[PDB]
Amino acid sequence: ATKSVLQPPAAGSASIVGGAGGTQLLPKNISQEWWKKATEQSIIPTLSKSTPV
Amino acid sequence: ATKSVLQPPAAGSASIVGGAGGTQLLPKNISQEWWKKATEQSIIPTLSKSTPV
Numbered sequence: 001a002t003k004s005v006l007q008p009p010a011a012g013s014a015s016i017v018g019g020a021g022g023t024q025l026l027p028k029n030i031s032q033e034w035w036k037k038a039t040e041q042s043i044i045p046t047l048s049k050s051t052p053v
Numbered sequence: 054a055t056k057s058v059l060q061p062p063a064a065g066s067a068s069i070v071g072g073a074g075g076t077q078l079l080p081k082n083i084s085q086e087w088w089k090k091a092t093e094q095s096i097i098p099t100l101s102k103s104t105p106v
Contacts (some may be wrong), residue, residue: 033104
């Protein structure tokens with residue numbers, strides 16, 4: 001049979017990583033760029049009279 | 054007995070190309086400008102954020 005790497009294996013094929021634990025061999029690419037919201041600005045220091053404290 | 058060129062020949066007339074296979078001598082004037090629609094633009098590569106994959 002021809003060797004598959006995707007999971008589950010394609011029909012009539014064999015999985016290259018088909019050995020026990022072999023899927024731990026499949027690569028990962030982790031993005032350097034996150035999904036994170038911006039946080040809310042503080043308005044009070046802008047929207048008030050500054051004083052010595 | 055007067056000699057036509059349009060097909061089929063007019064009534065009471067002889068075709069000028071009435072010999073066997075003679076219509077293969079009539080000119081065509083095929084246009085270089087096609088009739089074809091444009092197809093729809095793909096938008097996903099324009100809209101999406103690019104990433105390594």
